[PDB]
Design a protein around this nucleic acid. Structure first.
Ligand code: MG
Ligand code: MG
Ligand code: MG
Ligand code: MG
Ligand code: MG
Ligand code: MG
Ligand code: MG
Ligand code: MG
Ligand code: MG
Ligand code: MG
Ligand code: MG
Ligand code: MG
Ligand code: MG
Ligand code: MG
Ligand code: MG
Ligand code: MG
Ligand code: MG
Ligand code: MG
Ligand code: MG
Ligand code: MG
Ligand code: MG
Ligand code: MG
Ligand code: MG
Ligand code: MG
Ligand code: MG
Ligand code: MG
Ligand code: MG
Ligand code: MG
Ligand code: MG
Ligand code: MG
Ligand code: MG
Ligand code: MG
Ligand code: MG
Ligand code: MG
Ligand code: MG
Ligand code: MG
Ligand code: MG
Ligand code: MG
Ligand code: MG
Ligand code: MG
Ligand code: MG
Ligand code: MG
Ligand code: MG
Ligand code: MG
Ligand code: MG
Ligand code: MG
Ligand code: MG
Ligand code: MG
Ligand code: MG
Ligand code: MG
Ligand code: MG
Ligand code: MG
Ligand code: MG
Ligand code: MG
Ligand code: MG
Ligand code: MG
Ligand code: MG
Ligand code: MG
Ligand code: MG
Ligand code: MG
Ligand code: MG
Ligand code: MG
Ligand code: MG
Ligand code: MG
Ligand code: MG
Ligand code: MG
Ligand code: MG
Ligand code: MG
Ligand code: MG
Ligand code: MG
Ligand code: MG
Ligand code: MG
Ligand code: MG
Ligand code: MG
Ligand code: MG
Ligand code: MG
Ligand code: MG
Ligand code: MG
Ligand code: MG
Ligand code: MG
Ligand code: MG
Ligand code: MG
Ligand code: MG
Lengths: 275, 92, 48
RNA sequence: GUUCGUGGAGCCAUGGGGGAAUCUGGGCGGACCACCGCCUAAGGCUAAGUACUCCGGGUGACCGAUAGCGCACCAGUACCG
RNA sequence: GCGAAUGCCGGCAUGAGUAACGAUAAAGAGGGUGAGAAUCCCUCUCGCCGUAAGCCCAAGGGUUCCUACGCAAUGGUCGUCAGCGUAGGGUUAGGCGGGACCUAAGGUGAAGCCGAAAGGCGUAGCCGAAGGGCAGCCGGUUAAUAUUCCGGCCCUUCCCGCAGGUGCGAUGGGGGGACGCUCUAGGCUAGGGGGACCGGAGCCAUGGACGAGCCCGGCCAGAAGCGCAGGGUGGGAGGUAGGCAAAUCCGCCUCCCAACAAGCUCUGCGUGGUGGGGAAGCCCGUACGGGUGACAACCCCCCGAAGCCAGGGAGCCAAGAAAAGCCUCUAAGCACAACCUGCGGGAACCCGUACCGCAAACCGACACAGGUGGGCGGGUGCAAGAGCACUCAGGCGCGCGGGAGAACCCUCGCCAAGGAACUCUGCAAGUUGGCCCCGUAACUUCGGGAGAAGGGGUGCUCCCUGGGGUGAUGAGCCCCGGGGAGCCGCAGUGAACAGGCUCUGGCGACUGUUUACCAAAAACACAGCUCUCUGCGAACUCGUAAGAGGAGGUAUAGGGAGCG
């Protein structure tokens, strides 16, 4: 389940490590389809924009091809399940009958050597890529696509799974892991089953490290600021919050619908968020 | 234009110690080339040279009175001559 | 402690050099003010 | 912009919206209407007279090495950054 | 028209022959040069560093390096000396470090995008290094150059002619190059310690000693080949849509076989043709140093690395660059060409090269008690060790000294009796201190507190004995011990390096970070918890915009806020 530790040192009593049991399929990593160095930069051309990112360990990018129309109707063979520090889920080093190396994120419960095909002529088993009009209703599904022939973007984190809640003509209604009933189009691809690695919630980072290992700089709190930077800063001995709730750029941080109201990607949702 | 060559032998004590061997060192043009020196000595002196070796001499800063300047920046070369024959014009 | 001027040939050459002036719109202002003032060394010379 | 700062606010160019006519067609004479006068816009060029002195020379109720340009001298140099 | 503006500029005063003369490592003496010597040169003693106050490089500085002649000025004094002045020399590279090779962050930048203009993004490509690849080791020579000059010896690139063989050939494809941290098994090397063995000029001091007596050195480099230790690699046949396919190459599936192996390739070490070095001591010694003592010896044993085999093995999560050389297959092209291996002959280019480089030459206005990256960095004893004490090779006595030995300042040592009574406070100082052996509480998140607190021993001599490693099974040599018998001193880690402890509360969970240069904290951060927003051309941020961060991420993710 969870790899734990007895508190032989402080800042080790609560530090839990995820189970490295599916990683036994390959101990090294195939250096064929991942040559691209991930240039790890927290900033744009000069300015730190996303505040407190960077640092950490050197990380190498794994080129995935989630465009499952790369080979339509060509079966595969899941031969390895390996680690991926970019995504939050372990990926599946799978070969082809054609013989082409391919990295796909591993769904919930893969093994070694089963057959999986990225085509519409595929029965319902966990791994296959099928269009949403060919997905049956009620079946859990992940790696679904918003607008067709644009890859696979929705529900790719660990343990998450979208679910078909019915059909409305040409657009299918599926709920996302937030609980937002959204319609998408019917020939974009989708991989059934949950993603897995559902122990990703249950891990505890432990010390101040494993944030500095992963590359999150120390997120300084706003109540200890100065009034030059933050509206909450200053005050003689922790002054209370200065009558807003606020971000460091003025806009209210608790309860502000900052979504673009007249966005053309609207009109498809028939729900907003499950509470 | 023959873009010509050697200014002067350096007439030093190590030069006259290299006079017993086939060394025969001299100053050159500061933008010369180690093949161009072999081309210069083997045609201007009618000899055969095995191994030219050059080195770039930086001039010393030097003054006369209260006005400081520097001596020029110039290159020095040695020429390893093929045995048997030598030069019979450098007898300083 | 460290003093402010820790010298460096390549940092001085790529920082205050002639092309380090001439690739900027303000370095041409420098190279048109040093000539009007009449400096003998228009760019800080790096000794080789 | 013209003296014009929205005032009765013309004229000259226009960022946007509507939008024609070719001498019985138009613009102007300071909200505007009629008469009466001036001129042809929506294409372009044009010397001469006017400003200034790196430089050349002549002059000065201009100065005479703490003056005069920062430098009468091997000065935008030595030196500082 | 000057006397004032804490006016300015230049000169000269007071402070005054006053403080200081720059780490409290230390100087003394005899000769020589010289007009002049505590300071320059030589010799004999003493002291200091010796994980450097020694040596080798990269930074940095730019002739400061050497010789000869001098003290106008400088050296916190003098100075005949000088890193000071004048003149003359000195840096030698196919193999060392860079370019003619490549690439990362980043920069420039064909196409393209945006912006009043200057300009700003930006694919391909280019630049970009203490990153990858690439062919050199030993010794001598000068006053100054040495992996460069020379002596030995081994290699690399390119071209030409010949011999043999081949379907040769890319800016194309493919494998490899290609990588984390910690612990590390085996062998070797660097380095080091002994020997009754080898060689050497000498000595028997002062009481004893002509002997396993004292002292010094017992090496380095080295091609082919041969041994030792490792690393890499399954050998063939067919099919295959893929390598933004052109493939016999690679990937996938069927394998008669081999399969912890062996074969074939790649390194390191030893031996190896041979070459070089060869002391301590003694004569000639101005300096420098030269002959030396040899026909020099150049043997054996042990300790042993962080270094090499290396891309070894095991464990862990935080998951650990790119491209080029080189190996292979082909497209256009060429197959009288082109490529590979030998045999002989040629060519190998541009820059750096001196000196200081943990300081007097770098940065600090200074010959400044500050700071400056990498490597070697010995020996003996303290359990160990780059710590401590001393000392090899190497340097140095710190560029003002000599008297007296007042108060007073700094540093250090000691003290009858009291033992914190002084003070805002055991502030400071002092004790404990290292190792081995018994013992260790309240309380708890069962780890910890804890080295709790408290104690006993530590020196030397002899005898017996358990072993382990190398060596051969032990003789020899190192390491871990145990018991008994004694001996001396007040004291036995006899010197130096080395915890004061306990109880009780406050605050912060803890490690860590900050107010460079008056505040290291009850301040910041932290894991974790909660709220809110964001479904993607996301939210939010920078930018007029393009665009970029987010992110080559997807509500188990990201942004903001609060408590911690
Ligand atoms: Mg590859
Ligand atoms: Mg956090
Ligand atoms: Mg504050
Ligand atoms: Mg600020
Ligand atoms: Mg504010
Ligand atoms: Mg050279
Ligand atoms: Mg107006
Ligand atoms: Mg108008
Ligand atoms: Mg308009
Ligand atoms: Mg009008
Ligand atoms: Mg009008
Ligand atoms: Mg006109
Ligand atoms: Mg004039
Ligand atoms: Mg003047
Ligand atoms: Mg006068
Ligand atoms: Mg300067
Ligand atoms: Mg006066
Ligand atoms: Mg005064
Ligand atoms: Mg004055
Ligand atoms: Mg007096
Ligand atoms: Mg006095
Ligand atoms: Mg006095
Ligand atoms: Mg005094
Ligand atoms: Mg003293
Ligand atoms: Mg003396
Ligand atoms: Mg004397
Ligand atoms: Mg005398
Ligand atoms: Mg003396
Ligand atoms: Mg240099
Ligand atoms: Mg200097
Ligand atoms: Mg000089
Ligand atoms: Mg002299
Ligand atoms: Mg003098
Ligand atoms: Mg003096
Ligand atoms: Mg004299
Ligand atoms: Mg000197
Ligand atoms: Mg000199
Ligand atoms: Mg280049
Ligand atoms: Mg070339
Ligand atoms: Mg390049
Ligand atoms: Mg390239
Ligand atoms: Mg780039
Ligand atoms: Mg760029
Ligand atoms: Mg640009
Ligand atoms: Mg390089
Ligand atoms: Mg390299
Ligand atoms: Mg040679
Ligand atoms: Mg071929
Ligand atoms: Mg050896
Ligand atoms: Mg003997
Ligand atoms: Mg006697
Ligand atoms: Mg020995
Ligand atoms: Mg011996
Ligand atoms: Mg050998
Ligand atoms: Mg080892
Ligand atoms: Mg590549
Ligand atoms: Mg040198
Ligand atoms: Mg030297
Ligand atoms: Mg050092
Ligand atoms: Mg200095
Ligand atoms: Mg001094
Ligand atoms: Mg100093
Ligand atoms: Mg340091
Ligand atoms: Mg002892
Ligand atoms: Mg020892
Ligand atoms: Mg020490
Ligand atoms: Mg000595
Ligand atoms: Mg002395
Ligand atoms: Mg002295
Ligand atoms: Mg002194
Ligand atoms: Mg005294
Ligand atoms: Mg007392
Ligand atoms: Mg007492
Ligand atoms: Mg009291
Ligand atoms: Mg009192
Ligand atoms: Mg104290
Ligand atoms: Mg051993
Ligand atoms: Mg704390
Ligand atoms: Mg402070
Ligand atoms: Mg402080
Ligand atoms: Mg983006
Ligand atoms: Mg969050
Ligand atoms: Mg807080």
């Amino acid at each position: 389940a969870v790899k734990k530790f007895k508190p032989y040192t402080p800042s080790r009593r609560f530090m839990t490590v995820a189970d490295f049991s599916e990683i036994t399929k390959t101990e090294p990593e195939k250096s064929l389809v991942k040559p691209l160095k991930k240039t790890g930069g927290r900033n744009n051309q000069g300015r730190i924009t996303v505040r407190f990112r960077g640092g950490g360990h050197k990380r190498l990018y794994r080129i995935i091809d989630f465009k499952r129309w790369d080979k339509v109707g060509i079966p595969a063979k899941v031969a390895a399940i390996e680690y991926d520090p970019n995504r939050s889920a372990r990926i599946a080093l799978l070969h082809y009958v054609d013989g082409e190396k391919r990295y796909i994120i591993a769904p919930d419960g893969l093994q070694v050597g089963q057959q999986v095909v990225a085509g519409p002529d595929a029965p319902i088993q966990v791994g296959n890529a099928l269009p949403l009009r060919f997905i049956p209703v009620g079946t859990v599904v992940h790696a679904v696509e918003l607008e067709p022939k644009k890859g696979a973007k929705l529900a790719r984190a660990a343990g998450t799974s979208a679910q078909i809640q019915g059909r409305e003509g040409d657009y299918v209604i599926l709920r996302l892991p937030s609980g937002e009933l959204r319609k998408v189009h019917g020939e974009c691809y989708a991989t059934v089953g949950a993603v897995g690695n559902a122990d990703h919630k249950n891990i505890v980072l432990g010390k101040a490290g494993r944030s500095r290992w992963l590359g999150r700089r120390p997120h300084v709190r706003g109540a200890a600021m100065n009034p030059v930077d933050h509206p909450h800063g200053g005050g003689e001995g922790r002054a209370p919050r200065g009558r807003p709730p606020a971000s460091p750029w003025g806009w209210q941080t608790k309860g502000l619908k900052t979504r673009k109201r007249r966005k053309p990607s609207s009109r498809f949702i028939i729900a907003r968020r499950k509470k | 234009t023959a873009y010509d060559v050697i200014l002067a032998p350096v007439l030093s004590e190590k030069a006259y110690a290299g006079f017993a061997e086939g060394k025969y060192t001299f100053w050159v043009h500061p933008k010369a080339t180690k093949t161009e020196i072999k081309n210069a000595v083997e045609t201007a002196f009618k000899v055969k040279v095995v191994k030219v070796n050059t080195l770039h001499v930086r001039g010393k800063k030097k003054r006369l009175g209260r006005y400081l300047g520097k001596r020029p920046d110039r290159k020095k070369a040695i020429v390893q001559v093929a045995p048997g024959q030598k030069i019979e014009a450098l007898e300083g | 402690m460290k003093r402010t001027w820790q010298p460096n040939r390549r940092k001085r050459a790529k920082t205050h050099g002639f092309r380090a002036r001439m690739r900027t719109p303000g370095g041409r202002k420098v190279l048109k003010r040093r000539r009007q003032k009449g400096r003998w060394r228009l760019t800080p010379a790096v000794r080789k």
